[PDB]
């Protein structure tokens, strides 16, 4: 059993509930965590 057009599955309305909460905020739970995590890595230890 399958639907017709765009897009499935899915799943209107899940363009802003499934593909933005664990997809765009993934670029936040690791990308923004890198902002504070890297502030003590770039100097350890390229400058010995």
């Amino acid at each position: 059993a399958d639907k017709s057009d765009l897009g499935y599955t899915g799943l209107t309305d899940e363009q802003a509930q499934e593909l933005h909460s664990v997809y765009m905020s993934g670029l936040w739970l690791f990308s923004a965590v890198a902002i504070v995590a890297h502030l003590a890595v770039y100097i350890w230890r390229p400058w010995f």
Partner: protein, 42 residues
């Protein structure tokens, strides 16, 4: 659309960074002149 949201979105970011970071840890372990406790040796 398509792909996986209740499947391959919490398992495409758990063995993917571990397959890009922790395997990358080995090359900065390939140093023994740097290295974060080998400095005592060199």
């Amino acid at each position: 659309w398509m792909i996986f949201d209740p499947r391959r979105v919490f398992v495409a970011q758990g063995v993917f960074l571990f397959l890009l970071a922790v395997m990358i840890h080995l090359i900065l372990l390939s140093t023994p002149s740097y290295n974060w406790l080998e400095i005592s040796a060199a």
